[PDB]
Amino acid sequence: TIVIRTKKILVNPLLSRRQLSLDVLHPDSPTASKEKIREELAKQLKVDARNVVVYGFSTQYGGGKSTGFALVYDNQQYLLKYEPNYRLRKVKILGEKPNTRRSFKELKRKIKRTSGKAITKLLSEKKGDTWASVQSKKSDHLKNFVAK
Amino acid sequence: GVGKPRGIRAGRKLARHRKDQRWADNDFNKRLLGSRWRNPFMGASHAKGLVTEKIGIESKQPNSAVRKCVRVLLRKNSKKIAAFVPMDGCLNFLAENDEVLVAGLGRQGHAVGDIPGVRFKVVCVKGISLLALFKGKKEKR
Amino acid sequence: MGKTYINTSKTYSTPRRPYEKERLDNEMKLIGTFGLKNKREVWRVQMILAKFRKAARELLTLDPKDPRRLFEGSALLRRMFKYGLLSEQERKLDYVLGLTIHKLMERRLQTRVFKLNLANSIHHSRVLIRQRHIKVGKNLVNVPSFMVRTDSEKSIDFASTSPLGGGREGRTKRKNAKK
Amino acid sequence: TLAKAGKVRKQTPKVEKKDKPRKTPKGRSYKRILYNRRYAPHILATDPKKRKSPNWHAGKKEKMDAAA
RNA sequence: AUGGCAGUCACGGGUAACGGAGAAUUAGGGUUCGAUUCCGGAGAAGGAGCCUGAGAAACGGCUACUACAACUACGGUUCGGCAGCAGGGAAGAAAAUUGGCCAAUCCUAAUUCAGGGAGCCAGUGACAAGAAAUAGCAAGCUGGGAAACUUACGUUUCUACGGCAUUGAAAUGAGAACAGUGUAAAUCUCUUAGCGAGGAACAAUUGGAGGGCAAGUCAUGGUGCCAGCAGCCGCGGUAAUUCCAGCUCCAAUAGCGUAUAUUAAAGUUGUUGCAGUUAAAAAGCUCGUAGUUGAACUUCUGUUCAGGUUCAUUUCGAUUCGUCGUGUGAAACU
Ligand SMILES: [Mg+2]
Ligand SMILES: [Mg+2]
Ligand SMILES: [Mg+2]
Ligand SMILES: [Mg+2]
Ligand SMILES: [Mg+2]
Ligand SMILES: [Mg+2]
Ligand SMILES: [Mg+2]
Ligand SMILES: [Mg+2]
Ligand SMILES: [Mg+2]
Ligand SMILES: [Mg+2]
Ligand SMILES: [Mg+2]
Ligand SMILES: [Mg+2]
Ligand SMILES: [Mg+2]
Ligand SMILES: [Mg+2]
Ligand SMILES: [Mg+2]
Ligand SMILES: [Mg+2]
Ligand SMILES: [Mg+2]
Ligand SMILES: [Mg+2]
Ligand SMILES: [Mg+2]
Ligand SMILES: [Mg+2]
Ligand SMILES: [Mg+2]
């Protein structure tokens, strides 16, 4: 199978995590799937898989070696507060990313031309996804998850 | 010594002298006197125009021949132009009043040794490169 | 809003005299000797040899004990060594000049793969280092105009390529229909 | 004149081109063939003062065979 | 009060002139450009005026005029100024999508969560730059050869080799693709399984073949000073080496012609580095303030010490693949 060598590692107590460079050796098989790399790593570190997030990879011009960077968080409860909204939909935890631009630009249109009376109403119709909403969803992953 | 003065204090002199004695150069005297801007193209490299009529011109000295030429009207400039239509059948494509793209022949001035007072080449008919119309497998309207 | 900042540079060099009988003859005798493709390549090489001598002359213009020369001179030589253009016993800058384009041409992935009996020809080799059939260092080299450094001239095989790994390109397409 | 436009071309009998027997290698190959047909050591071998013109083979079938 | 500036060029005019950082070619010295990512300046239709503010004469704020753009029930109105992006019109030789997003870089705000055509993504994109395929190997036939075997054209062999509408299987990106990587998403690249090359194929052009300028001594066809070529010499008037075209060749080659400005060749604008009897060029001749240019003298010199430096060496100690230390002489430095 694969052979991973961990390369450059820092210790960030601030965001409570350790950052490391990864060098996957797959001489034979094609680039490793982030997923599979996620676990062969968690095993060498001996840490829950979901508390280890791996991002950015490459693949030297045909040679079976891929470089990448990963993250080790101690509390998935920390990981959930720090990681980016986009990395979460990626583990299928946060979800969708609907097209805000267009409509938001159009509401600006109406609102900029009204008095408070209606404005409030309009606002009660701008494409969802509040941050207040992002949190409640983040929170639910919090309680409902426990293990390792 | 020679004419030029060799003083370390006389730089000014030599300087003004060169700036002066330099007008004796046509290449200099040329661009320096915004001459390029007064020609029919107004400095330009190419010019669009409408065919005023296909006329023919006679060769000079040891040559005797009917050269194909089109009298063109440049657009923003608005001047009468003498334009030589290149290769063999060429003029057979230029229909009177079509749009033509013209450029000069070897340094804007002397026409090809053969031609008389023609200073331009015709490269496009209705916006269709001539060469293209010259080779069957290319284009035609 | 386009504001690039990467850098240009032409590897070319157009010659003044466009039809030198004697010059063209060498370029061709050269292209045929090194399995080149276009005259360009040949100039690409001359242009390189240039940067070296122009830097050698630039340095010779200095006192023999110039902080600059002493440092840049040596480092230039050190580089002629890593690419093996001058032999150990050819330190002195003055030698940087007597460098045949023929010599610098010989230190290419092309010229090497062939002179390493690793190919049937100056050409055979050319399509090879192309089909990936050749790995150098810990990486694979595809570009025939590689500047083969001395140190790594050992590491030159075919890692996981049909002629060492596991072929089946023209083979597969072949044997299946035979039946 | 005028109507005398392109008198020549119109009068020319359109001959056709010899449909490529095989192919003309385009790439290092062509430059290779050339290297061989002229600067290959057997020609640089015989006098450099008595070697033929890269087109004396004007396409002459009679001198084409005499050489080969 | 009467000064202030000026041939050591005032004042005035031109500039297809916003200044720099820099850009192109360069023996040296030069020549020509700099709208254009940095900086500084100026401006927002022209022009003046102003509110406000710590801060602008702002201008994606306001007032009037000149010329305009949008609506009108013609009373009146516009948060009317794209030299911001995306787009039209116009000009013209000439320059892309009325796309995506806030994920990265930074910015702004009451501000860890909000907004940003800054900016980044992507589309268009041979401006331009980097790497690079259009084939490689071998059998056989065969030219060459060649080393040989050897008085002649014959066999062995081999080789820098070199040819082929003959042979043969390996190789392989273009291509096209489940996966993975990458991404805000999407496209692409990269890794990679199933599929993917043998002749009009899966592909080279462009521009020439008298001279300059590399390449036809074809006894080729058509044309007949006509059509046309030609950068400059010159081609062409019935046997064209330059036209039209075939063939074969050459050159640069995913590129190659052309037009124009510009650099070098230009010691053809020359300080370096020209010319001036006759080729262009000494004024007809003298005076003469500006300018340019100016003779020779003023501690030289000697002795000794010292630090290196070099160089020399009928020479010494060390090391090696080329240096150090020691001694003399010498010079000069100090
Ligand atoms: Mg948002
Ligand atoms: Mg004449
Ligand atoms: Mg492979
Ligand atoms: Mg002025
Ligand atoms: Mg300027
Ligand atoms: Mg600016
Ligand atoms: Mg200032
Ligand atoms: Mg715009
Ligand atoms: Mg952002
Ligand atoms: Mg935001
Ligand atoms: Mg407050
Ligand atoms: Mg882009
Ligand atoms: Mg390119
Ligand atoms: Mg995919
Ligand atoms: Mg075959
Ligand atoms: Mg051709
Ligand atoms: Mg021609
Ligand atoms: Mg011809
Ligand atoms: Mg003839
Ligand atoms: Mg040229
Ligand atoms: Mg001149």
Short mmCIF file of N, CA, C and O (backbone and C1' of nucleotides) in Angstrom, two decimals, chain E residues 207-253:
data_model
loop_
_atom_site.label_atom_id
_atom_site.label_comp_id
_atom_site.label_asym_id
_atom_site.label_seq_id
_atom_site.Cartn_x
_atom_site.Cartn_y
_atom_site.Cartn_z
P G E 207 2.95 33.26 -47.95
"O5'" G E 207 4.47 33.18 -48.45
"C5'" G E 207 5.38 34.20 -48.08
"C4'" G E 207 6.82 33.81 -48.39
"C3'" G E 207 7.31 33.68 -49.83
"O3'" G E 207 7.49 34.95 -50.48
"C1'" G E 207 8.35 32.08 -48.41
P G E 208 7.87 35.03 -52.07
"O5'" G E 208 9.27 34.26 -52.18
"C5'" G E 208 9.89 33.98 -53.44
"C4'" G E 208 11.29 33.44 -53.23
"C3'" G E 208 11.97 32.79 -54.43
"O3'" G E 208 12.73 33.75 -55.18
"C1'" G E 208 12.02 31.33 -52.55
P A E 209 12.99 33.53 -56.76
"O5'" A E 209 13.96 32.28 -56.80
"C5'" A E 209 15.20 32.32 -56.13
"C4'" A E 209 15.92 31.00 -56.30
"C3'" A E 209 15.84 30.41 -57.69
"O3'" A E 209 16.81 30.99 -58.54
"C1'" A E 209 15.44 28.72 -56.08
P G E 210 16.40 31.42 -60.01
"O5'" G E 210 17.79 31.55 -60.73
"C5'" G E 210 18.90 32.07 -60.03
"C4'" G E 210 19.89 32.67 -60.99
"C3'" G E 210 20.74 33.74 -60.33
"O3'" G E 210 21.81 33.10 -59.67
"C1'" G E 210 19.80 34.62 -62.30
P G E 211 21.80 33.04 -58.07
"O5'" G E 211 22.64 34.35 -57.70
"C5'" G E 211 23.92 34.61 -58.32
"C4'" G E 211 24.22 36.10 -58.40
"C3'" G E 211 24.19 36.91 -57.11
"O3'" G E 211 25.43 36.77 -56.44
"C1'" G E 211 23.09 38.09 -58.84
P G E 212 25.49 36.00 -55.04
"O5'" G E 212 25.13 37.11 -53.95
"C5'" G E 212 26.00 38.22 -53.69
"C4'" G E 212 25.21 39.43 -53.19
"C3'" G E 212 24.34 39.22 -51.96
"O3'" G E 212 25.10 39.38 -50.76
"C1'" G E 212 23.09 40.36 -53.64
P C E 213 25.14 38.19 -49.66
"O5'" C E 213 24.42 36.95 -50.37
"C5'" C E 213 24.15 35.73 -49.67
"C4'" C E 213 22.83 35.18 -50.13
"C3'" C E 213 22.75 34.99 -51.64
"O3'" C E 213 23.05 33.65 -52.20
"C1'" C E 213 20.74 36.06 -50.71
P A E 214 24.32 32.72 -51.71
"O5'" A E 214 23.65 31.79 -50.59
"C5'" A E 214 24.37 30.75 -49.92
"C4'" A E 214 23.44 29.59 -49.58
"C3'" A E 214 22.73 28.97 -50.78
"O3'" A E 214 23.59 28.01 -51.36
"C1'" A E 214 21.13 29.41 -49.10
P A E 215 23.89 28.07 -52.94
"O5'" A E 215 22.73 27.13 -53.51
"C5'" A E 215 22.53 25.84 -52.94
"C4'" A E 215 21.11 25.40 -53.18
"C3'" A E 215 20.67 25.40 -54.64
"O3'" A E 215 20.93 24.11 -55.20
"C1'" A E 215 19.06 26.50 -53.25
P G E 216 21.42 23.96 -56.72
"O5'" G E 216 20.14 24.40 -57.56
"C5'" G E 216 20.28 25.07 -58.80
"C4'" G E 216 19.55 24.32 -59.88
"C3'" G E 216 19.50 24.96 -61.25
"O3'" G E 216 20.70 24.66 -61.97
"C1'" G E 216 17.43 23.94 -60.69
P U E 217 21.83 25.77 -62.15
"O5'" U E 217 22.62 25.30 -63.44
"C5'" U E 217 22.37 25.91 -64.69
"C4'" U E 217 22.34 24.87 -65.77
"C3'" U E 217 21.25 23.81 -65.63
"O3'" U E 217 20.02 24.33 -66.12
"C1'" U E 217 23.34 22.76 -66.02
P C E 218 19.04 23.44 -67.04
"O5'" C E 218 19.28 21.91 -66.68
"C5'" C E 218 18.73 20.91 -67.52
"C4'" C E 218 17.57 20.23 -66.84
"C3'" C E 218 16.50 19.71 -67.77
"O3'" C E 218 16.93 18.43 -68.23
"C1'" C E 218 15.55 20.64 -65.77
P A E 219 16.04 17.61 -69.28
"O5'" A E 219 16.64 18.02 -70.68
"C5'" A E 219 15.80 18.49 -71.72
"C4'" A E 219 15.92 19.98 -71.84
"C3'" A E 219 15.52 20.53 -73.20
"O3'" A E 219 14.10 20.77 -73.30
"C1'" A E 219 17.74 21.20 -72.67
P U E 220 13.37 21.87 -72.36
"O5'" U E 220 12.67 21.01 -71.21
"C5'" U E 220 12.08 19.74 -71.51
"C4'" U E 220 10.68 19.69 -70.96
"C3'" U E 220 9.75 20.79 -71.43
"O3'" U E 220 9.18 20.51 -72.70
"C1'" U E 220 9.55 20.55 -69.10
P G E 221 8.71 21.72 -73.65
"O5'" G E 221 7.28 22.11 -73.11
"C5'" G E 221 6.18 21.26 -73.33
"C4'" G E 221 4.99 21.72 -72.53
"C3'" G E 221 4.54 23.14 -72.79
"O3'" G E 221 3.76 23.26 -73.97
"C1'" G E 221 4.63 22.77 -70.47
P G E 222 3.98 24.54 -74.93
"O5'" G E 222 3.12 25.68 -74.23
"C5'" G E 222 1.71 25.56 -74.12
"C4'" G E 222 1.17 26.59 -73.17
"C3'" G E 222 1.47 28.03 -73.54
"O3'" G E 222 0.56 28.52 -74.51
"C1'" G E 222 1.98 27.69 -71.26
P U E 223 1.08 29.51 -75.66
"O5'" U E 223 1.40 30.86 -74.88
"C5'" U E 223 0.39 31.51 -74.10
"C4'" U E 223 0.96 32.71 -73.38
"C3'" U E 223 1.74 33.69 -74.25
"O3'" U E 223 0.85 34.67 -74.78
"C1'" U E 223 2.99 33.17 -72.30
P G E 224 1.00 35.13 -76.31
"O5'" G E 224 2.33 35.98 -76.33
"C5'" G E 224 2.58 36.97 -75.35
"C4'" G E 224 3.96 37.50 -75.56
"C3'" G E 224 4.16 38.14 -76.92
"O3'" G E 224 4.21 39.54 -76.61
"C1'" G E 224 5.78 36.40 -76.50
P C E 225 4.48 40.65 -77.74
"O5'" C E 225 5.12 41.86 -76.93
"C5'" C E 225 6.49 41.86 -76.53
"C4'" C E 225 6.64 42.55 -75.20
"C3'" C E 225 6.31 44.03 -75.18
"O3'" C E 225 4.91 44.12 -75.05
"C1'" C E 225 8.13 43.51 -73.72
P C E 226 4.16 45.49 -75.37
"O5'" C E 226 2.67 45.21 -74.86
"C5'" C E 226 2.43 44.79 -73.51
"C4'" C E 226 1.48 43.61 -73.48
"C3'" C E 226 1.04 43.14 -72.10
"O3'" C E 226 -0.02 43.93 -71.60
"C1'" C E 226 1.51 41.27 -73.48
P A E 227 -0.29 43.99 -70.02
"O5'" A E 227 -0.36 42.47 -69.61
"C5'" A E 227 -1.58 41.75 -69.72
"C4'" A E 227 -1.48 40.48 -68.92
"C3'" A E 227 -1.10 40.69 -67.47
"O3'" A E 227 -2.28 40.91 -66.72
"C1'" A E 227 0.32 39.07 -68.44
P G E 228 -2.24 41.82 -65.40
"O5'" G E 228 -1.17 41.07 -64.49
"C5'" G E 228 0.05 41.70 -64.06
"C4'" G E 228 1.09 40.63 -63.74
"C3'" G E 228 2.33 41.03 -62.96
"O3'" G E 228 2.09 41.02 -61.57
"C1'" G E 228 3.01 39.80 -64.83
P C E 229 3.10 41.80 -60.59
"O5'" C E 229 4.46 40.98 -60.71
"C5'" C E 229 4.53 39.63 -60.27
"C4'" C E 229 5.96 39.15 -60.29
"C3'" C E 229 6.95 39.92 -59.43
"O3'" C E 229 6.94 39.46 -58.08
"C1'" C E 229 7.84 39.65 -61.59
P A E 230 7.31 40.48 -56.90
"O5'" A E 230 8.71 41.07 -57.36
"C5'" A E 230 9.88 40.26 -57.38
"C4'" A E 230 11.08 41.10 -57.74
"C3'" A E 230 11.13 42.46 -57.07
"O3'" A E 230 11.68 42.39 -55.76
"C1'" A E 230 11.42 42.75 -59.38
P G E 231 10.93 43.14 -54.55
"O5'" G E 231 11.35 44.66 -54.78
"C5'" G E 231 10.82 45.70 -53.97
"C4'" G E 231 11.90 46.27 -53.08
"C3'" G E 231 13.16 46.73 -53.80
"O3'" G E 231 13.04 48.15 -54.22
"C1'" G E 231 13.72 45.16 -52.04
P C E 232 12.95 48.59 -55.82
"O5'" C E 232 14.46 48.65 -56.33
"C5'" C E 232 15.34 49.65 -55.83
"C4'" C E 232 16.79 49.20 -55.85
"C3'" C E 232 17.34 48.81 -57.21
"O3'" C E 232 17.71 50.00 -57.88
"C1'" C E 232 18.03 47.23 -55.60
P C E 233 17.84 50.00 -59.47
"O5'" C E 233 18.84 48.81 -59.71
"C5'" C E 233 19.24 48.47 -61.00
"C4'" C E 233 20.40 47.54 -60.91
"C3'" C E 233 20.57 46.71 -62.15
"O3'" C E 233 21.42 47.43 -63.03
"C1'" C E 233 20.62 45.33 -60.20
P G E 234 20.89 47.82 -64.48
"O5'" G E 234 20.66 46.41 -65.18
"C5'" G E 234 19.37 46.01 -65.63
"C4'" G E 234 19.01 44.65 -65.06
"C3'" G E 234 18.15 43.76 -65.96
"O3'" G E 234 18.98 42.98 -66.82
"C1'" G E 234 17.20 43.84 -63.82
P C E 235 18.32 42.24 -68.08
"O5'" C E 235 17.28 41.25 -67.40
"C5'" C E 235 16.24 40.74 -68.17
"C4'" C E 235 15.52 39.70 -67.40
"C3'" C E 235 14.35 39.14 -68.18
"O3'" C E 235 14.85 38.09 -69.00
"C1'" C E 235 13.63 39.80 -66.03
P G E 236 15.21 38.38 -70.54
"O5'" G E 236 13.77 38.45 -71.21
"C5'" G E 236 12.87 37.37 -71.03
"C4'" G E 236 11.44 37.81 -71.14
"C3'" G E 236 10.95 38.51 -72.39
"O3'" G E 236 10.84 37.57 -73.45
"C1'" G E 236 9.89 39.41 -70.47
P G E 237 11.92 37.58 -74.64
"O5'" G E 237 11.14 38.34 -75.79
"C5'" G E 237 9.76 38.10 -75.99
"C4'" G E 237 9.22 39.02 -77.05
"C3'" G E 237 9.98 39.00 -78.36
"O3'" G E 237 9.44 37.97 -79.15
"C1'" G E 237 9.63 41.23 -77.69
P U E 238 10.37 37.23 -80.19
"O5'" U E 238 10.14 35.68 -79.88
"C5'" U E 238 11.04 34.91 -79.06
"C4'" U E 238 10.78 33.42 -79.24
"C3'" U E 238 11.04 32.87 -80.65
"O3'" U E 238 12.27 32.12 -80.73
"C1'" U E 238 8.82 32.34 -79.92
P A E 239 13.61 32.62 -79.97
"O5'" A E 239 13.57 31.87 -78.56
"C5'" A E 239 12.39 31.22 -78.11
"C4'" A E 239 12.67 29.78 -77.75
"C3'" A E 239 13.36 29.53 -76.41
"O3'" A E 239 12.38 29.33 -75.40
"C1'" A E 239 14.33 28.21 -78.15
P A E 240 11.78 30.58 -74.59
"O5'" A E 240 12.19 30.28 -73.09
"C5'" A E 240 13.51 30.50 -72.63
"C4'" A E 240 13.58 31.85 -71.98
"C3'" A E 240 14.21 31.86 -70.60
"O3'" A E 240 15.57 32.20 -70.84
"C1'" A E 240 12.28 33.28 -70.75
P U E 241 16.69 31.89 -69.76
"O5'" U E 241 15.89 31.79 -68.38
"C5'" U E 241 15.22 30.59 -68.01
"C4'" U E 241 15.72 30.12 -66.66
"C3'" U E 241 15.47 31.03 -65.48
"O3'" U E 241 14.18 30.79 -64.97
"C1'" U E 241 17.68 30.20 -65.40
P U E 242 13.01 31.79 -65.34
"O5'" U E 242 12.38 32.21 -63.93
"C5'" U E 242 13.18 32.90 -62.96
"C4'" U E 242 12.43 34.09 -62.38
"C3'" U E 242 11.64 34.87 -63.43
"O3'" U E 242 10.25 34.52 -63.43
"C1'" U E 242 13.07 36.33 -62.20
P C E 243 9.54 33.97 -62.10
"O5'" C E 243 8.04 34.48 -62.22
"C5'" C E 243 7.72 35.87 -62.06
"C4'" C E 243 6.63 36.28 -63.02
"C3'" C E 243 5.47 35.30 -63.10
"O3'" C E 243 4.49 35.61 -62.13
"C1'" C E 243 6.24 35.78 -65.29
P C E 244 3.98 34.46 -61.14
"O5'" C E 244 3.15 33.51 -62.10
"C5'" C E 244 1.86 33.90 -62.55
"C4'" C E 244 1.26 32.83 -63.44
"C3'" C E 244 1.23 31.42 -62.90
"O3'" C E 244 0.12 31.22 -62.07
"C1'" C E 244 1.97 31.37 -65.11
P A E 245 0.30 30.40 -60.73
"O5'" A E 245 0.92 29.01 -61.22
"C5'" A E 245 0.05 27.94 -61.57
"C4'" A E 245 0.78 26.78 -62.21
"C3'" A E 245 1.66 25.84 -61.39
"O3'" A E 245 0.93 24.92 -60.58
"C1'" A E 245 2.56 26.16 -63.57
P G E 246 1.70 24.03 -59.47
"O5'" G E 246 2.50 22.95 -60.31
"C5'" G E 246 1.80 21.93 -61.04
"C4'" G E 246 2.77 20.97 -61.69
"C3'" G E 246 3.90 20.43 -60.83
"O3'" G E 246 3.46 19.36 -59.99
"C1'" G E 246 4.74 21.02 -62.96
P C E 247 4.07 19.20 -58.51
"O5'" C E 247 5.51 18.59 -58.77
"C5'" C E 247 5.64 17.34 -59.43
"C4'" C E 247 7.02 17.21 -60.04
"C3'" C E 247 8.18 17.39 -59.08
"O3'" C E 247 8.40 16.19 -58.35
"C1'" C E 247 8.59 18.62 -61.03
P U E 248 8.57 16.27 -56.77
"O5'" U E 248 10.11 16.61 -56.61
"C5'" U E 248 11.09 15.76 -57.18
"C4'" U E 248 12.40 16.49 -57.29
"C3'" U E 248 12.83 17.22 -56.04
"O3'" U E 248 13.45 16.34 -55.11
"C1'" U E 248 13.02 18.68 -57.86
P C E 249 13.83 16.88 -53.65
"O5'" C E 249 15.19 17.65 -53.92
"C5'" C E 249 15.70 18.52 -52.94
"C4'" C E 249 16.37 19.70 -53.57
"C3'" C E 249 16.42 20.83 -52.59
"O3'" C E 249 17.50 20.62 -51.74
"C1'" C E 249 15.58 21.63 -54.61
P C E 250 17.21 20.47 -50.20
"O5'" C E 250 17.56 21.92 -49.67
"C5'" C E 250 18.59 22.68 -50.30
"C4'" C E 250 18.38 24.17 -50.11
"C3'" C E 250 18.00 24.64 -48.72
"O3'" C E 250 19.17 24.79 -47.93
"C1'" C E 250 16.67 25.75 -50.33
P A E 251 19.09 24.61 -46.34
"O5'" A E 251 18.23 25.86 -45.85
"C5'" A E 251 18.80 27.18 -45.83
"C4'" A E 251 17.77 28.22 -45.44
"C3'" A E 251 17.00 28.02 -44.14
"O3'" A E 251 17.78 28.45 -43.04
"C1'" A E 251 15.52 28.72 -45.84
P A E 252 17.85 27.55 -41.73
"O5'" A E 252 16.56 27.98 -40.93
"C5'" A E 252 16.60 29.15 -40.15
"C4'" A E 252 15.22 29.64 -39.86
"C3'" A E 252 14.28 28.66 -39.18
"O3'" A E 252 14.51 28.56 -37.78
"C1'" A E 252 13.17 29.62 -40.99
P U E 253 14.50 27.11 -37.10
"O5'" U E 253 12.96 26.71 -37.15
"C5'" U E 253 11.96 27.70 -36.99
"C4'" U E 253 10.63 27.18 -37.45
"C3'" U E 253 10.18 25.86 -36.87
"O3'" U E 253 9.65 26.03 -35.55
"C1'" U E 253 9.72 25.92 -39.19
#
